[PDB]
Design an enzyme around this catalytic site. Sequence first.
Site, PDB file in Angstrom:
ATOM      1  N   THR A   1      -8.038   6.973  -2.954  1.00 11.82           N
ATOM      2  CA  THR A   1      -9.367   6.487  -3.332  1.00 11.82           C
ATOM      3  C   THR A   1     -10.352   7.624  -3.183  1.00 11.82           C
ATOM      4  O   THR A   1     -11.393   7.645  -3.836  1.00 11.82           O
ATOM      5  CB  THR A   1      -9.857   5.290  -2.476  1.00 11.82           C
TER       6      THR A   1
ATOM      7  N   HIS B   1       0.758  -1.247   0.000  1.00 11.36           N
ATOM      8  CA  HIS B   1       0.000   0.000   0.000  1.00 11.36           C
ATOM      9  C   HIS B   1       0.791   1.301   0.000  1.00 11.36           C
ATOM     10  O   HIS B   1       0.206   2.367  -0.139  1.00 11.36           O
ATOM     11  CB  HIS B   1      -0.957   0.015   1.201  1.00 11.36           C
TER      12      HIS B   1
ATOM     13  N   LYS C   1      -8.924  14.095   3.904  1.00  5.79           N
ATOM     14  CA  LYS C   1      -8.136  12.868   4.016  1.00  5.79           C
ATOM     15  C   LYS C   1      -7.308  13.011   5.293  1.00  5.79           C
ATOM     16  O   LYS C   1      -7.308  14.067   5.921  1.00  5.79           O
ATOM     17  CB  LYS C   1      -7.203  12.697   2.814  1.00  5.79           C
ATOM     18  N   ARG C   2      -6.607  11.964   5.693  1.00  2.94           N
ATOM     19  CA  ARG C   2      -5.819  12.075   6.908  1.00  2.94           C
ATOM     20  C   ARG C   2      -4.777  13.184   6.757  1.00  2.94           C
ATOM     21  O   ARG C   2      -4.259  13.407   5.659  1.00  2.94           O
ATOM     22  CB  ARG C   2      -5.147  10.736   7.216  1.00  2.94           C
TER      23      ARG C   2
ATOM     24  N   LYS D   1     -13.685   8.952  -5.434  1.00  2.00           N
ATOM     25  CA  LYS D   1     -14.999   9.296  -4.910  1.00  2.00           C
ATOM     26  C   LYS D   1     -15.482  10.647  -5.456  1.00  2.00           C
ATOM     27  O   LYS D   1     -16.650  10.786  -5.832  1.00  2.00           O
ATOM     28  CB  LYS D   1     -14.966   9.327  -3.382  1.00  2.00           C
TER      29      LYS D   1
ATOM     30  N   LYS E   1       0.772  14.460   2.107  1.00  5.22           N
ATOM     31  CA  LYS E   1      -0.475  14.804   1.424  1.00  5.22           C
ATOM     32  C   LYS E   1      -0.527  16.300   1.121  1.00  5.22           C
ATOM     33  O   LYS E   1      -1.380  16.765   0.365  1.00  5.22           O
ATOM     34  CB  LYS E   1      -1.674  14.403   2.272  1.00  5.22           C
TER      35      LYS E   1
HETATM   36  C1  LIG Z   1     -12.015   7.317   1.009  1.00  5.66           C
HETATM   37  C2  LIG Z   1     -11.579   7.741   2.450  1.00  5.66           C
HETATM   38  C3  LIG Z   1     -10.230   7.927   2.794  1.00  5.66           C
HETATM   39  C4  LIG Z   1      -9.043   7.829   1.735  1.00  5.66           C
HETATM   40  O1  LIG Z   1      -8.898   9.114   1.129  1.00  5.66           O
HETATM   41  P1  LIG Z   1      -7.551   9.516   0.278  1.00  5.66           P
HETATM   42  O2  LIG Z   1      -7.760  10.924  -0.132  1.00  5.66           O
HETATM   43  O3  LIG Z   1      -7.333   8.470  -0.733  1.00  5.66           O
HETATM   44  O4  LIG Z   1      -6.382   9.538   1.344  1.00  5.66           O
HETATM   45  C5  LIG Z   1      -9.912   8.313   4.074  1.00  5.66           C
HETATM   46  N1  LIG Z   1     -10.886   8.502   5.007  1.00  5.66           N
HETATM   47  C6  LIG Z   1     -12.189   8.320   4.705  1.00  5.66           C
HETATM   48  C7  LIG Z   1     -13.207   8.668   5.765  1.00  5.66           C
HETATM   49  C8  LIG Z   1     -12.557   7.937   3.428  1.00  5.66           C
HETATM   50  O5  LIG Z   1     -13.890   7.801   3.088  1.00  5.66           O
END
Ligand SMILES: *Cc1c(COP(=O)(O)O)cnc(C)c1O
EC number: 2.4.1.1
Lengths: 830, 830
Positions: free
Chosen positions: B664, B365, B556-557, B668, B562
């Site tokens: 991911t 990952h 995101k985190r 979305k 990032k």
């Molecule tokens: C989809 C999702 C993530 C992953 O987001 P990235 O931008 O790919 O880091 C993290 N947290 C939640 C709550 C998500 O739905």
Amino acid sequence: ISVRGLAGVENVTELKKNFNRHLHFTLVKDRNVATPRDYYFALAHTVRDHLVGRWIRTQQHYYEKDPKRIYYLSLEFYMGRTLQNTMVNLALENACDEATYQLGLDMEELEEIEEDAGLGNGGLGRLAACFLDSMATLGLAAYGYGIRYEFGIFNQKICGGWQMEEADDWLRYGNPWEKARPEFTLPVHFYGRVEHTSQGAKWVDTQVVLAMPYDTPVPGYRNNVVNTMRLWSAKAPNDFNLKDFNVGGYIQAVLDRNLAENISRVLYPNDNFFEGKELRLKQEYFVVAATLQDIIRRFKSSKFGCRDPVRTNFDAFPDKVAIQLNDTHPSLAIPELMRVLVDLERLDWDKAWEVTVKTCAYTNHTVIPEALERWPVHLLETLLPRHLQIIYEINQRFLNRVAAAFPGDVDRLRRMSLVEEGAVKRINMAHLCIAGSHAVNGVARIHSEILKKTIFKDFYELEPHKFQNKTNGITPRRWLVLCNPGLAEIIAERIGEEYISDLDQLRKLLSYVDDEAFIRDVAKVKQENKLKFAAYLEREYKVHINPNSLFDVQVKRIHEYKRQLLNCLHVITLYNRIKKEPNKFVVPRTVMIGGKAAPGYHMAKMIIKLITAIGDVVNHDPVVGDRLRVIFLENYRVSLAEKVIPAADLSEQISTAGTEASGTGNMKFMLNGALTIGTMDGANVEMAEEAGEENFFIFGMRVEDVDRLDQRGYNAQEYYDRIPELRQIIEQLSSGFFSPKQPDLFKDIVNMLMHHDRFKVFADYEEYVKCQERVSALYKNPREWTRMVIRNIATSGKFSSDRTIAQYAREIWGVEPSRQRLPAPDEKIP
Amino acid sequence: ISVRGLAGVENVTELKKNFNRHLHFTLVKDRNVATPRDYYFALAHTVRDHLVGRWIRTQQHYYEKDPKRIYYLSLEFYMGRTLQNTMVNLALENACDEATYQLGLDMEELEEIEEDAGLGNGGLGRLAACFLDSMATLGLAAYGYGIRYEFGIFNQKICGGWQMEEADDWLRYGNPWEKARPEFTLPVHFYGRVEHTSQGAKWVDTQVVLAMPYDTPVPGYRNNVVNTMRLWSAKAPNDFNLKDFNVGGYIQAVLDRNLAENISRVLYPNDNFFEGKELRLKQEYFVVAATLQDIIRRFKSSKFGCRDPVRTNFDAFPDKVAIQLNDTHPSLAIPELMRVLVDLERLDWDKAWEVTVKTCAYTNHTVIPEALERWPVHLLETLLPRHLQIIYEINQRFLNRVAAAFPGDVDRLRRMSLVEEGAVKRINMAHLCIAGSHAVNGVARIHSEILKKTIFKDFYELEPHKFQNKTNGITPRRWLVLCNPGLAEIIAERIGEEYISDLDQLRKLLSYVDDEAFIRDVAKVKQENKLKFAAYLEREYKVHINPNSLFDVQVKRIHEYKRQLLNCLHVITLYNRIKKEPNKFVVPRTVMIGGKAAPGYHMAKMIIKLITAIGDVVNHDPVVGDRLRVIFLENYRVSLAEKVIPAADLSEQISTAGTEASGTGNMKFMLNGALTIGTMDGANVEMAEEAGEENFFIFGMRVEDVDRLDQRGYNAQEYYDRIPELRQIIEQLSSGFFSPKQPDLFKDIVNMLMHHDRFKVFADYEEYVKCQERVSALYKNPREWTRMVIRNIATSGKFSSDRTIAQYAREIWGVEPSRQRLPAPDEKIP
Ligand SMILES: *Cc1c(COP(=O)(O)O)cnc(C)c1O
Ligand SMILES: CN1CC[C@H](c2c(O)cc(O)c3c(=O)cc(-c4ccccc4Cl)oc23)[C@H](O)C1
Ligand SMILES: CN1CC[C@H](c2c(O)cc(O)c3c(=O)cc(-c4ccccc4Cl)oc23)[C@H](O)C1
Ligand SMILES: *Cc1c(COP(=O)(O)O)cnc(C)c1O
């Protein structure tokens, strides 16, 4: 099949589909992978469904009518299994028996799968359980309040003849009876400090622990009343138990939540013994603090939370609330009620005290000193600072009352104080309870008298009106109908069913004492019960016993005061006499002794080893044959009691006179056709008085004889010197006759018996074995033994907890019992 | 109402009575005291009922047909709420909507009551969840195996602009979806030692911890398939965890059980970061040990536990079993499988290894070093002695393979070793996984290439056949139909419903790119979504935003890689430009940044404070007005994502090229009508490739540019010197412009940016703000912005997890996906 209710056509059909509904939808199983445990659960849920309708309307009913509520506070509720009891009180037993039969299942097999709810040690906890049943049956708006321990009384294992303790994970597979009510969680405070500001004291900087309630229904006997038992569980808040920042670790903080939650983790396994541990004190305050908030919330609603005089006048509090303290364990309810009324509601001290005393009542369970709760002041000082202040103030005002009543009696003052001086200052919880309660009761006539004459003599002189007696009792539903259907049936065949909720009607059986049919029947059910127990013994524990012998049983917690040791002396005597004259006839006996020892009670654990050691010798002596067997009943608990008691012939109730406050096991045996050999102690006195001393096997010193001996000074050597048979037994123990590999194994027992026997075992030995000889004589005459049994059964009516509760209701709580059926369970959805 | 299914006459009626059944019998409540939470529960149980029938037949089906089983091992399953998702996959949404409406309740209000099942940190955990949904929808006999944490990812609170963590007690009110299965409890061993005796090694003197499974159903999309997610819970045995006698205290022993049970207490809140704590290692072995026993038990039954060649021949094990390792967390499955096969089943090493490699596959990952699991040997040595021995032996044999392939290449040998020498010896779990798996895959094309070119270059040279790519995906059910019904409806209005399980069909939307009606509609649903979010914002968090502005969101985190910091620089730039020319027109924007920081990640927590600090200044500057708002989205989690994503206009995916393996969240946003501004990193590359780079806002260095800069040496001062706008921002931070009371508050951020920026924020600044200007230009042209949106939506089909799973199935597991409806749910009771 019996009078376990009707097996109606429509209801057996309804039951079956619901059993299947639950097996599918609730358990998510299919007939091809379902195990007996699954079937037990499908049935439990099906039965549980039948009382929710009633549960809801009962509670709604109380809300509408608004009667005086009874709050029974206890740190113990020894409930046992609840499936069968529920069926019995709902008249579902036969219908369920039929339905499971048609589904191809054995209901009795499924019932054995249910785990005991062992949230108690013995007598005290079982009494609370019997009381809950009676209060519901008598239609009282009563609530049982306690703690939901995730680990109840330990499961006892015997390894190498010694007791091994192992956690009682009774919730492992879930509890179908309870209903978690997280929406009613309440906060409880600990530690902190007291700030005295302008308009009152404030309890500040406290640690918060949440109390989450779990409700269990308590069905009355066939009256459609379903009361509630609310047990509190400890939960850590998610804030401070994480939010008190500045390093330590996020993970650690979360793991440390199991520090606040340890409060409801395990029941202290002590029976009639006080252990001053902080965790115990926390448990006591926890149940008290949460319960009182719930009680006041309910009160504020009542009909005052609508109109009435309008103005939260707690003047009516005692008219709507009654709090019964089961022993001193929940004693903090007194200073906690004051704290809330004074600190929070802002009532003046005197008005608050008036209310408190009028709503609280206390039940004393024992006079032995090591059971007395004396909490060190430094503990209360750190954990509950405001309560300590309130207790000092209560003490102050109380002693002023004493001084005014007995001017110049300076020693009386120190004797009655709630604060004890000495090594470390302590708070006498019993004195606290007497001062803040309008009623104090003993649990048997002799015990209540002893309280007035001894332990609480000074208090009785100050306020004689406070002292009462309420002889204990047992519920006839679980202790007769449930465990002995066979006996309940033949009794019902002659006098009807009305006795189940009116035990006094058992007297009518006196007129059948010469009835040839009845005598044969009473004797037949006892024989069937014995055969059943004798089978269960080989089934689950394995090693045969003779069902034709006299079943001599003593089951209760192992204690020096209960004298299982005296029983042992007799067993060894029997053995030695057989060895002396092998070819002489003696009535065969199977003596069964069972009971758990508190883990830290060394002497009690030594006695268990002695019992198994005796059995090792006796049970393998070829010369003895099947004339004498010594069996230790492993893991004695409520469900086991329901099995041995109905199978017993002789009930051993031999505590030293003046030590067993009442006892209840004694009542269980009387109701089930066993004759009693015992001392004039506790309720034994009232039992013999009810059946006639000629129908009881009484022996040993009376309370006065014990006192006489103490003035004189008890010297065991004397008895050792004058009784050869006794001497022979002590020398057998001393020499390793019962412990070959470890000859000195029982030196502690022998040393104690000879030099520090607080319970004078030797003093009652001679009269005890003499009396046992009389029992054997009578057993040799089946017809007369049975006729004496009928005299006991027919005269046990007074010992029903319905009678006890009716007395508490009228003489202490000020409420009237009622046997009125609640308006059916019928659907309804408003 | 929409295509949320049919609101049939018979079914709406059936639903209502069942809702009432549960409210009465299950919740034991009546309409007069029921709260919204009760109503939510009555509904959940009613919906849960509908899939047990299917759940039972699905599992029975697999037992009969006996297909190859897929076991997805993950320490994380980020599930979120399950009520709505269940209704959607069962086509119950409209019927339920109607039924609750008639009962007078607002279904949407009840859905908000459900707690998120936050058993994950972010991407990795959410991927496992999307995969479970796709595997069920594709009819695979798949099982998700993990740990049932009682505390999931912490709930984030912002106090004074700082993140505060608080326990996520998600089970507080109970979980209606799971089914405890105490009857399948398994033992797991820890510590102990290894005895080498005659015929094999023995793992001895171990501490036992029990693993109790809890099953949660995973419904496929309208195909009547319901798979299982089995989560293990830690339980202490009642024996040794009490029976290891000889003083300590009975009470203490019982309290100490919460030591073995701490294993499943809390999820480690680290995202892409390795923390070598013993508790973490215990969790990893715990899930692996219990799962493997379950897998083998099931296998021994199969059709071999009947006949077949007869002789437990594990030769067919890989034909019936496939174990997917989600990252290296469950890596101990490799040496554990060997241990069982060799030590317990007694297979020869080589045969066991053959089986192991053929059944295991590993998914990587990330390439960042601090995420790499390198366990110290002394830890494995103490906790899992036998596994360490097996790992050394695996290493030994593997390196011999390397030496034989590259004779004399001594450095290659040390580089490929599973054992790393140095300060403390460590075990490289990634190397372990590659050696014991027949397939190793990256999660996006660029990431998979990087693995072969860099991190795992030596391994790729040894066995090129092992390396594959499987670009991540998201489930269209939760990420479109569930969260954006409005968009799903207008799409369905033109192309039908078949795209829900065949996302590729979205391409057909390309032919509506010039359709006047469609453009107006796509634009309308986005406007409605924004108005809805803008309302939710004031409802639960309170402080207004303008729904007419461009919704610029990065959720995101919080991570340095990032680059939320890069976003911050842009926001400050926008602010400074407005302050310079107040009366100049600029496209209004609401930039929303949300995400949780690992508790111990100081820099990440500092960035959150910076974000809130910027908002404090910007949001209260009168000159700025409503043209610019900076909002920090609190407690970002799955349920919140379902709310913001459909409301977004611009999706920020700006990680430094080569650092985000795939991502991911990016997928979305594409599926929900947001345009993307990002770097050529992870899946962004494939997304731009699918939609056309002209329909994507790409900027910054590519992977090669980053490498070039590193050879050269990255010097932030250079950028500081040549860009006045950048210089001005750094001086504002340095001087306390954003932290008046604590002028040096952000010295750590500034110091890092200037001297130790591993992610070269400054290097992409110029191109980033330039690109942002292009986004604003296009936003000023509604019609063209929307047309570009349609090009993105229409081309997102490739990113459905159904595509991803179909590839894993065919190219790794060797199973064929199927969209065949399982034979209805129909009653049945054998
Ligand atoms: C989809 C999702 C993530 C992953 O987001 P990235 O931008 O790919 O880091 C993290 N947290 C939640 C709550 C998500 O739905
Ligand atoms: C002198 N010593 C004897 C043992 C006693 C003790 C323990 O040390 C530990 C225990 O668990 C118990 C117990 O459960 C009951 C009684 C008890 C209760 C009533 C009358 C007489 C006795 Cl001995 O005593 C216990 C205490 O330390 C005082
Ligand atoms: C030098 N130091 C910086 C902080 C880092 C660290 C912590 O001390 C504590 C943490 O919780 C994290 C985290 O969650 C993610 C990352 C991380 C992950 C990927 C790339 C770069 C970084 Cl900095 O780093 C963390 C570690 O001690 C090394
Ligand atoms: C009734 C009962 C007791 C109390 O018995 P006594 O002989 O009064 O001490 C203790 N334990 C159990 C299991 C009981 O049923």
